[PDB]
Design a protein around this ligand. Structure first.
Ligand SMILES: Cc1c(C#Cc2ccc(CN3CCC(CO)CC3)cc2)cc(C(F)F)c2cn([C@@H](C(=O)Nc3nccs3)c3ncn4c3CCC43CC3)nc12
Length: 281
């Protein structure tokens, strides 16, 4: 009944690879916890490199923090297997990452789904703020889909591999200029994440080299208004990208704003075939 289970190899198996990133490879798998009978669908992340006993102490201390993450909109770390290449286990999010989901299902996504994802991501980020955990890499690739109506944040930043140069196009200006990361720099990245959703997974600052992003931000340039977005929604994104971090909304305020929009979603996002979950009025 430990918060973080220390796994043996015999208790789990990899079924199908899902993806590889800068830190490791994720597999869909099955876990029968030692002393139990039930089969639990899991995601298994195997690190890229083998680690020493010393390195593993630093992984473990972080793993206990990730096992303490207990919120409906953030994934919890369930277990660790201290094999030579370490393996990390969560519950499987069977629909994969939200970035791929919105790209693959773009013709069957309405305003209600999009605005409810924005609420849910803000709820999970407000939980991280209450825990004093700065994410440092919020992006649609780091949001997972449990069901089409239920998403969760994962994979905190530990500075899509070609998005890292650090994820410059998601970062607040003060993070680019001085490597300052706070809950308010996570609000900036939340705004970029919302832009990704509202553009069905498009690439931010497409055509701008990463090396020029701080210059264009300093000139006042920002990501453009997505075609589906009313100006009211775009204004919240723009508030997330103000240069003064303390002027940006807080996650608690973003939950209120997106929750109100989610009551009349077709008024805020205009999608062809989406004719005019939080209940709609
Ligand atoms: C990469 C990494 C590491 C690591 C490491 C490393 C160390 C040294 C070296 C050697 N390295 C050599 C080069 C240089 C020399 O100094 C640096 C050191 C190499 C790698 C450690 C931990 C730890 F917390 F468990 C990690 C946790 N995640 C992920 C994770 O487990 N996601 C998964 N998704 C599917 C299933 S689990 C994560 N993040 C947040 N969350 C999660 C899940 C739940 C939740 C939201 C709450 N990711 C981790």
């Amino acid at each position: 009944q430990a918060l973080l289970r220390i796994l043996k190899e015999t208790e789990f198996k990899k079924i199908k690879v899902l993806g590889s990133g800068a830190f490791g490879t994720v597999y869909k798998g099955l876990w029968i916890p030692e002393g139990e009978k039930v089969k639990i669908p899991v995601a298994i992340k195997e690190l890229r490199e083998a680690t020493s006993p010393k390195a593993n102490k630093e992984i473990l201390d972080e793993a206990y923090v990730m096992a303490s993450v207990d919120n409906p909109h953030v994934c919890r770390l369930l277990g660790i297997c201290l094999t030579s290449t370490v393996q990390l286990i969560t519950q499987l999010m069977p629909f994969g990452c939200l970035l791929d989901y919105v790209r693959e299902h773009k013709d069957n996504i309405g305003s209600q789904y999009l605005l409810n994802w924005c609420v849910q991501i803000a709820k999970g980020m407000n939980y991280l703020e209450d825990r004093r955990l700065v994410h440092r890499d919020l992006a649609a690739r780091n949001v997972l889909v449990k069901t089409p109506q239920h998403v969760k944040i994962t994979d905190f930043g530990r500075a899509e591999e070609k998005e890292y140069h650090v994820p410059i196009k998601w970062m607040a200006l003060e993070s680019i200029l001085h490597r300052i990361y706070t809950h308010q720099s996570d609000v900036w990245s939340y705004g970029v994440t919302v832009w990704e959703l509202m553009t069905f997974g498009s690439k931010p600052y497409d055509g701008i080299p990463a090396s020029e992003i701080s210059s264009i931000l300093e000139k006042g340039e920002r990501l453009p208004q997505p075609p589906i977005c009313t100006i009211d929604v775009y204004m919240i994104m723009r508030k997330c990208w103000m240069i003064d971090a303390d002027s940006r909304p807080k996650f608690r305020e973003l939950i209120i704003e997106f929750s109100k929009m989610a009551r009349d979603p077709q008024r805020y996002l205009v999608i062809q075939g989406d004719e005019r979950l939080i209940p709609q009025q």
